[PDB]
Design a protein around this nucleic acid. Structure first.
Ligand SMILES: [Mg+2]
Ligand SMILES: [Mg+2]
Ligand SMILES: [Mg+2]
Ligand SMILES: [Mg+2]
Ligand SMILES: [Mg+2]
Ligand SMILES: [Mg+2]
Ligand SMILES: [Mg+2]
Ligand SMILES: [Mg+2]
Ligand SMILES: [Mg+2]
Ligand SMILES: [Mg+2]
Ligand SMILES: [Mg+2]
Ligand SMILES: [Mg+2]
Ligand SMILES: [Mg+2]
Ligand SMILES: [Mg+2]
Ligand SMILES: [Mg+2]
Ligand SMILES: [Mg+2]
Ligand SMILES: [Mg+2]
Ligand SMILES: [Mg+2]
Ligand SMILES: [Mg+2]
Ligand SMILES: [Mg+2]
Ligand SMILES: [Mg+2]
Ligand SMILES: [Mg+2]
Ligand SMILES: [Mg+2]
Ligand SMILES: [Mg+2]
Ligand SMILES: [Mg+2]
Ligand SMILES: [Mg+2]
Ligand SMILES: [Mg+2]
Ligand SMILES: [Mg+2]
Ligand SMILES: [Mg+2]
Ligand SMILES: [Mg+2]
Ligand SMILES: [Mg+2]
Ligand SMILES: [Mg+2]
Ligand SMILES: [Mg+2]
Ligand SMILES: [Mg+2]
Ligand SMILES: [Mg+2]
Ligand SMILES: [Mg+2]
Ligand SMILES: [Mg+2]
Ligand SMILES: [Mg+2]
Ligand SMILES: [Mg+2]
Ligand SMILES: [Mg+2]
Ligand SMILES: [Mg+2]
Ligand SMILES: [Mg+2]
Ligand SMILES: [Mg+2]
Ligand SMILES: [Mg+2]
Ligand SMILES: [Mg+2]
Ligand SMILES: [Mg+2]
Ligand SMILES: [Mg+2]
Ligand SMILES: [Mg+2]
Ligand SMILES: [Mg+2]
Ligand SMILES: [Mg+2]
Ligand SMILES: [Mg+2]
Ligand SMILES: [Mg+2]
Ligand SMILES: [Mg+2]
Ligand SMILES: [Mg+2]
Ligand SMILES: [Mg+2]
Ligand SMILES: [Mg+2]
Ligand SMILES: [Mg+2]
Ligand SMILES: [Mg+2]
Ligand SMILES: [Mg+2]
Ligand SMILES: [Mg+2]
Ligand SMILES: [Mg+2]
Ligand SMILES: [Mg+2]
Ligand SMILES: [Mg+2]
Ligand SMILES: [Mg+2]
Lengths: 393, 240, 339, 121, 46
RNA sequence: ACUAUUCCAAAAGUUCUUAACAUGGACUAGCAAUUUCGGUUGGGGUGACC
RNA sequence: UCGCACACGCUUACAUCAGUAACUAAUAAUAUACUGAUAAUUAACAACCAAUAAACCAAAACAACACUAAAACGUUUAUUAAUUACAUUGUUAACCCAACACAGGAGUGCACCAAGGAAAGAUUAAAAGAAGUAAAAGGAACUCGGCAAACACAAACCCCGCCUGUUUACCAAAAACAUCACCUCUAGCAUUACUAGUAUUAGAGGCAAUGCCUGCCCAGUGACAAGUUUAACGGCCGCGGUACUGACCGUGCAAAGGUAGCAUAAUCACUUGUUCUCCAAAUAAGGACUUGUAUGAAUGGCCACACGAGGGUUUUACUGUCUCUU
RNA sequence: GACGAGCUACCCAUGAGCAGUUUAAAAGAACCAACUCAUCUAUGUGGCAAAAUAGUGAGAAGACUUGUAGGUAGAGGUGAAAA
RNA sequence: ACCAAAGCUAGCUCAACAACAAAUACAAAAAUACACCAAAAUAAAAUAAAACAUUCACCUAACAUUAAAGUAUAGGA
């Protein structure tokens, strides 16, 4: 056991007590009388100091066990920034879910409809890319923290323009930074996703379940993958004080009660600061799961049952250059057992919007080889994006 | 005057931690050791040299862990592996062919019948066979391993006497230990570290190494080729 | 070179008269002349929009739970900003079904509007350059809460030669006494979007008022009329820049002047109280040179300050004023003339 | 180098900030915004002057006086002595509780205490 | 190259090296302060 | 002096042993300390001489 | 044509009005610097401006993804954070460090002018000195040397270093040092150096990459453990006889008797060694020859690429260096 | 026995700069500015200057320059040794 | 005739006797926040000895004064 302190650092131990405290019955005479240090006087010891009235700021931090909400049951918290080791695998085991490659076919047929495209699609999306990636900033080369939310919001604005053709879209309201508390029991281990995602799109009307019953029953047979050496819990935050209550960012009787789409941005500049595209997928699976379980226990309640009316949520997530689409159908409120019928997750991953961008003309041998702009454009990714936006109408 | 060492942190972490390098100075500001300074900026990874380290003191038994990744480290010759299991991640020193997506065993258990060693296997010496290749070797049981960490180097178990192992260090000096102590079986990563060639003075400076002096000296008596019979064997066995 | 930073939001005593002095602006109380040329569009639902507006107000001030704040001071800045954003965002789709111009538009979210311009003259008092003649320079750095951008210019509220009995206030002072400060750095002319953008023209803006400038703080400070003026000033600044940028973007400047008057709108907001503004920029030459004989002026029409709601209580909004919604809709329904 | 001149906030770098000796009214806030305490700002207590007759100067032929600086004892005589002889003559004198004459045993009760001297002026 | 310019004035450096504080932090520096008091210097220290 | 060496002693123990400190006395080095570098001399040196 | 601003640093040298006979200006005129009176820079810029637990292995380089030297930068969850108009402080300059109102030293961002500025107190038109332009014919004949200068701005061969780097602030920038490489010695190990390392590692040195090599010597002096070591200090022979030379022979002495190379050298002297080439002529330069009796092998020997503000020689071209000055 | 590392030598933190051209290349590669040094000559020698000026020169993504701020102190420091 | 020149005081020497108040050790003169504090180790050499190696009065201490006495002694004697 090589210890991790360095004696040279560790706060200096008390000077060994002056020997006049070694003599029974004797009164050590100390400089406590002069209220300042003196040599030649023995050194005093002092009562632990008690300012009988407690000042709120300067006081010694309340020891943690003292709290009312404190519980002795270890609880694993997951929040906005938690990093999971095996992203989708772990995500699923925590969630008791199975993943399917493509998006649901309904949303597909939405996307590919000749009718649902904008006026000039490529014009608009290329212009949104160029704006967010270049035109929105004063400086030549903007950073990720600005342009990522700019691109996501610009997409959202191109889709908001569809409300004229499809005026069922007035049913939706956006919400930023929403306290979300979802507590459940999974296989003797207590898991709670607690915190704020970036952006929530709420719908006035719930979402129609996208899985045929065949999918459900076939999901009942699926064997969950196990990663042995790794506890499923790894990448979470242990805690001894938490609240078990089912909360979504809103009180009773909210006019836009049903969570529709969640938006997860990666805005950071450092590579290691962001999420790896896998861990992102995980994070948004668990969170989508949360948004689902919230309503599930709102409209039905804490009882552990399988759902007769399947919940469905969506999530999009972003580098600003690269997207992850996800749709989550909650099928079960009893996850303690491992052997029941499982929720379903569709994930369209790593959908590249553009390849790479150039803000300055790239020049070789006194010629301009490459102009400024995006290289490559996938109308596919946007197609799916709009699609996920349009799913309620 | 006074300086503090950067080496202060209590918690084990996998995350790379920034550190202040000191060319050759002691805590006074004097120069202890010439030649050091101006390296490239380096982070330090916390390396667990105690390979068998039960995660919770509740369940004592033999471990298994997984290799997640293998990375270059600036601090040592050796390549390091990021290994996790249960709820903990830890860096340990990587044996030659350990690759990502892998399984590595730790055990303190001594069976009569010995065992068959994979590379990454950490074991009590006395439970290994008598010709094996070992590295990251501990002095006294529980201490953490000190000997045989460098790149491409490996030691060898010689014989087993009296409930005690005898091994051979890379200096070809032999070492006498209790059999109870843990060692990893194999050779350390990056075995061609020997044959790397510094191309230019620069690379040497990049390593943090400043030139030798320019003061010309005469070679003293001490110079020559010395031929010594081997030094006697180190025994960490304390007699009753 | 050296310039004066002109802030929209200000603690200065009378900023209005000062900024008119800067900008060559003339202030007219009351909304611009109603363009009776309107087609019989108003089939609009005031109940659907009462609904839509109070949705935001209530999500914000009641339903939506934020990680508990220790102040309990319930910052109006952190409170209103999301309400404002979600309000513009919500209303846009709705009114755009009637007014499709807003479907093609891009909404600007907290992004800078810059402007740079020359005005007046100075014999420089101190320095080794003392006694010499220098132009006075200003730079507006703005960060409106929301702007709206379109691909075509908005119709002028009056002709370009239109004149008024009211004259631009000339302050006797140097602006420093306002207070104002000279700090030099890069001078940017910016619309929120680079020149390359397809949307060259501003529609409206939305300025949430900063915490310093809350009403209550002003009445504590023994400041009465200032409550109004704070609004005024802000408009006369931002709008101006907002307009100017556009002009500059079209190739206009102080020596090319302007062919076709530029116009944008603005909405200035303390979370409860609103005010409504229209800027018509005519003269882009404030350089003393072009200025000597220059007849035209720049104009802002504005609304007296006014509440939206009164006293939200327990998921109900007690006080409400349709008037607000009405002029809001007015603004938001403004259109490029069609050919 | 200037040795002789005094050190002021005006001489140093950016980082050097030294107040000229005005008194501090507050503490720093959460956001970094600065916080004032209404109770740290000195509040001047001013009577109405209009109602009374007094002036900044006095008539010249108005007399000066025999100069008696106030002594502890004089004070004791004017205030404490009459009541004291009053209640010793009555025989109701209680050397134990002197509080009826105005004596205060210890000062920590009252608003303005003399010895630790709580009040500015 | 050309010399005599040696003193690059810094206030933080002036007061960190010759500052009253720094003198008091050492027995020797105190001796200095004293020696200067005994000669009645106007300036005890920076 | 000091840094290491090696030793007898001293201390603790066993019936001859030594873990870190550590004292006295020696040894062997390294690092070093104090101090000098005579006179004649057909200038001084080399030679020769006293 | 070194302009504007900031940081640092300077302190009122800044501003207005009045004064200057003299004091500052190295002169005057008048005044940013001398004198007096009186004023003055205003916070949004800047300084001040939270902790304790907890997850996070994954660079910046228009960052797609990678490179090797492995790279500073913060989000969120939880626990408490005095809650309340206005706190305090810096804001002038033509400025600083060089004793000067010094041709010098001075970091950053933007600009090459939209900004800043004057080389000449007045004449005269001597010599000598400084800087510049041009010059017939000639083209290095100058001279230690083509130093400087030029309508030239090309080639070649040498010695020494391998190379980019460093050194004597202020007489030496090199052939010195360092350096990749090669080599010896010393080390078996834990919280302040070395090192949060562990013998492919880390220290004390040596010599200078590559290529071919690196011979014999432990007697002396060290060094290590009596014995062992020279990629430790250090050494590496005579005297005669023989077919002008001496393979061969005698004998002595040494611990071994100097090899492979190389050679009149940056190598005591003799010495301008002998000869060949170069030139009309060479104590120069290159090639050979060569006992250097004082070359010579990691106190490194030998070639060779590239490299050199190193040190020499040739040629082209060019010229006021020179004939010989104007 | 005090005092000095604001110069300079060396670190230690911590900021900042390197345009164009050639190159598959940011390769202790080329060309050439800013920047950095200081070869060679002439001025200058109580100088503009107690080491400068003018030309001329080498390096110029590196063992590179440089800002602020700490650190080592004379029987010592520090040194790509020039005492 | 310029430049200059002269004053006698300021104080000194030796010896006897015996303006609050605020603020100050943050970079002193900055009312106000969580710690640490503090400590000691022969004086040396220059110089005398005609050099320099053992040694070289005073140099710390109080103890004075008149003597014993430059004596007994100690010294590369
Ligand atoms: Mg290292
Ligand atoms: Mg070496
Ligand atoms: Mg050497
Ligand atoms: Mg001074
Ligand atoms: Mg200051
Ligand atoms: Mg300053
Ligand atoms: Mg300053
Ligand atoms: Mg000086
Ligand atoms: Mg300097
Ligand atoms: Mg002596
Ligand atoms: Mg002699
Ligand atoms: Mg003599
Ligand atoms: Mg003689
Ligand atoms: Mg003679
Ligand atoms: Mg002799
Ligand atoms: Mg000065
Ligand atoms: Mg004068
Ligand atoms: Mg200024
Ligand atoms: Mg003249
Ligand atoms: Mg002449
Ligand atoms: Mg001439
Ligand atoms: Mg000629
Ligand atoms: Mg000649
Ligand atoms: Mg001649
Ligand atoms: Mg010649
Ligand atoms: Mg030349
Ligand atoms: Mg010429
Ligand atoms: Mg030669
Ligand atoms: Mg060289
Ligand atoms: Mg170079
Ligand atoms: Mg020199
Ligand atoms: Mg130098
Ligand atoms: Mg020189
Ligand atoms: Mg060699
Ligand atoms: Mg060399
Ligand atoms: Mg020997
Ligand atoms: Mg030979
Ligand atoms: Mg030969
Ligand atoms: Mg010779
Ligand atoms: Mg020889
Ligand atoms: Mg040899
Ligand atoms: Mg040798
Ligand atoms: Mg040599
Ligand atoms: Mg030799
Ligand atoms: Mg080469
Ligand atoms: Mg050359
Ligand atoms: Mg060179
Ligand atoms: Mg060189
Ligand atoms: Mg320094
Ligand atoms: Mg470059
Ligand atoms: Mg280069
Ligand atoms: Mg010339
Ligand atoms: Mg060059
Ligand atoms: Mg070169
Ligand atoms: Mg310092
Ligand atoms: Mg010191
Ligand atoms: Mg150096
Ligand atoms: Mg030397
Ligand atoms: Mg020498
Ligand atoms: Mg005082
Ligand atoms: Mg002496
Ligand atoms: Mg003597
Ligand atoms: Mg004498
Ligand atoms: Mg003495």
């Amino acid at each position: 056991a090589y210890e991790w302190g360095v004696r040279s650092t560790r706060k200096p131990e008390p000077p060994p007590l002056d020997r006049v405290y070694e003599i029974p019955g004797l009164e050590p005479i100390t400089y406590a009388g002069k209220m300042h240090f003196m040599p030649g006087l023995a050194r005093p010891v002092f009562p632990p100091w008690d300012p009988g009235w407690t000042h709120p700021k300067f006081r010694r931090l309340p020891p943690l066990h003292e709290h009312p909400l404190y519980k002795d049951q270890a609880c694993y918290v997951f929040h906005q920034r938690c990093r999971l080791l095996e992203g989708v695998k772990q995500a699923l085991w925590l969630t008791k879910t199975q993943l399917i490659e493509g998006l649901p076919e309904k949303v597909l047929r939405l996307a590919d409809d000749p009718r649902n495209h904008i006026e000039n699609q490529d014009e608009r999306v290329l212009n949104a890319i160029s704006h967010a990636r270049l035109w929105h900033s004063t400086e030549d080369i903007p950073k990720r923290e600005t342009y990522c939310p700019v691109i996501v919001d610009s997409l959202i604005q191109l889709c908001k323009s569809q409300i004229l053709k499809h005026p069922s879209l007035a049913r939706r309201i956006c919400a930023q930074n929403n306290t979300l508390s979802a507590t459940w029991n999974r296989e003797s281990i207590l898991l709670q996703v607690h915190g704020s995602s970036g952006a929530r799109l709420n719908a006035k009307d719930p979402l129609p379940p996208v899985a045929s019953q065949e999918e459900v029953e076939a999901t009942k047979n699926h064997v969950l993958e196990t990663f042995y050496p790794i506890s499923p819990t790894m990448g979470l935050q242990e805690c001894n004080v938490y609240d078990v209550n089912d909360d979504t960012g809103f009180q009773e009787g909210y006019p836009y009660p049903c969570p529709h789409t969640l938006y997860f941005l990666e805005s950071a500049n450092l590579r290691p600061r962001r999420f790896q595209p896998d861990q992102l997928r995980a994070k948004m699976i668990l969170f989508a799961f949360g948004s689902a379980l919230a309503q599930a226990r709102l409209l039905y309640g804490n009882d552990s049952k399988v759902l007769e009316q399947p919940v469905v949520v969506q999530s999009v997530g972003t580098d600003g250059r690269l997207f992850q689409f996800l749709v989550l159908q909650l099928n079960t409120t009893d996850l303690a057992s491992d052997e029941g019928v499982k929720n379903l997750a569709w994930v369209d991953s790593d959908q590249l919007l553009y390849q790479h961008f150039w803000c300055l003309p790239v020049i070789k041998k006194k010629v301009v080889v490459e102009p400024v702009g995006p290289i490559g454009f996938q109308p596919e990714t946007f197609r799916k994006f709009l699609a996920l936006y349009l799913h309620g109408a | 005057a006074t300086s503090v060492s950067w080496k202060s942190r209590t918690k084990y972490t996998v995350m790379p931690v920034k550190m202040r390098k000191s060319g050759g100075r002691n805590h006074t500001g004097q120069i202890q050791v010439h030649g050091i300074g101006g390296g490239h900026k380096q982070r330090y990874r916390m390396i667990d040299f105690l390979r068998f380290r039960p995660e919770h003191e509740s369940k004592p038994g033999p471990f298994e862990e997984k290799v997640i990744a293998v990375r270059y480290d600036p601090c040592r010759s050796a390549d390091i592996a990021l290994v996790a299991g249960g709820n903990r991640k830890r860096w340990i020193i990587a044996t030659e062919n350990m690759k990502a997506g892998d399984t590595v065993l730790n055990s303190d258990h001594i069976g009569r019948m010995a065992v068959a060693a994979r590379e990454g296997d950490a074991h009590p010496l006395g439970a290994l066979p008598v010709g094996t290749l070992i590295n990251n070797v501990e002095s006294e049981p529980g201490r953490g391993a000190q000997y045989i960490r460098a790149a491409g180097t490996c030691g060898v178990l010689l014989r087993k006497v009296n409930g005690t192992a005898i091994i051979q260090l890379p200096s070809k000096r032999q070492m006498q230990v209790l059999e109870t102590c843990i060692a990893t079986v194999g050779r350390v990563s990056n075995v061609d570290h020997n044959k790397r060639v510094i191309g230019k003075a620069g690379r040497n400076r990049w390593l943090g190494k400043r030139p030798n002096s320019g003061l010309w000296q005469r070679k003293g008596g001490w110079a020559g080729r010395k031929i010594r019979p081997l030094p006697p064997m180190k025994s960490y066995v304390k007699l009753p | 070179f050296m310039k004066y930073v002109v802030y929209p939001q200000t603690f200065a005593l009378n900023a209005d008269n000062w900024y008119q002095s800067f900008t060559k602006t003339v202030f007219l109380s009351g909304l611009p002349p109603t363009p009776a040329k309107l087609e019989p569009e108003p089939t609009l639902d005031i109940t659907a929009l009462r609904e839509a507006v109070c949705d935001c107000l209530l999500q914000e001030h009641f339903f939506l739970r934020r990680k508990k704040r220790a102040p309990v001071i319930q910052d109006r800045e952190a409170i209103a900003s999301p309400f404002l954003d979600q309000l513009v965002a919500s209303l846009t789709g709705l009114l755009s079904v009637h007014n499709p111009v807003l479907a093609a538009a891009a909404l600007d979210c907290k992004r800078p509007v810059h402007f740079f311009w020359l005005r007046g003259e100075e014999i420089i008092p101190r320095g080794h350059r003392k006694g010499r003649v220098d132009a006075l320079r200003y730079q507006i750095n703005d960060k409106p809460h929301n702007q709206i951008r379109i691909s075509r210019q908005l119709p002028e509220f009056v002709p370009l030669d239109y004149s008024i009995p009211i004259e631009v206030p000339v302050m006797s002072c140097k602006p420093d006494k306002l207070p104002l400060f000279k700090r030099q750095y890069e001078n940017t002319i910016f619309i929120g979007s680079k020149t390359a953008d397809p949307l060259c023209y501003g529609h409206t803006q939305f300025h949430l008022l900063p915490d310093k400038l809350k009403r209550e703080k002003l009445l504590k400070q023994n400041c009465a009329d200032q409550i109004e003026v704070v609004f005024r000033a802000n408009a006369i600044a931002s709008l101006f820049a907002w307009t100017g940028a556009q002009a500059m973007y079209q190739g206009f400047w102080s020596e090319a002047d302007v062919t076709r008057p530029f116009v944008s709108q603005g909405v200035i907001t303390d979370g409860k109280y609103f005010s409504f503004f229209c800027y018509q920029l005519n003269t882009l030459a404030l350089t003393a040179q072009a200025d000597q004989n220059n007849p035209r002026k720049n104009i802002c029409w504005g609304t007296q300050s006014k509440p939206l709601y009164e006293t939200i209580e327990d998921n109900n909004v007690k006080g409400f004023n349709d008037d607000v919604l009405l002029q809001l809709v007015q603004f938001l329904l403004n259109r490029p003339k069609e050919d | 180098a200037d040795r002789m001149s005094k050190w002021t906030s005006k001489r140093g770098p950016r980082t050097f900030c030294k107040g000229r000796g005005a008194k501090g009214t507050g503490f720093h806030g959460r956001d970094g915004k600065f916080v004032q305490i209404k109770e740290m700002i000195p509040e001047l207590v001013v009577p109405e002057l209009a109602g009374f007759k007094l002036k900044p100067y006095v008539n010249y032929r108005a007399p000066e006086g025999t100069d008696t600086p106030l002594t502890a004892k004089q004070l004791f005589l004017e205030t404490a002595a009459p009541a004291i002889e009053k209640d010793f003559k009555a025989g109701t004198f209680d050397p134990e509780h002197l509080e009826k004459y105005g004596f205060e045993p210890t000062q920590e009760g009252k608003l303005f205490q003399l010895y630790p001297k709580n009040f500015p002026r | 190259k050309a010399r005599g310019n040696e003193y690059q004035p810094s206030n933080i450096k002036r007061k960190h090296k010759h500052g009253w504080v720094r003198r008091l932090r050492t027995p020797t520096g105190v001796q200095v302060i004293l020696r200067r008091m005994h000669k009645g210097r106007k300036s005890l220290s920076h």
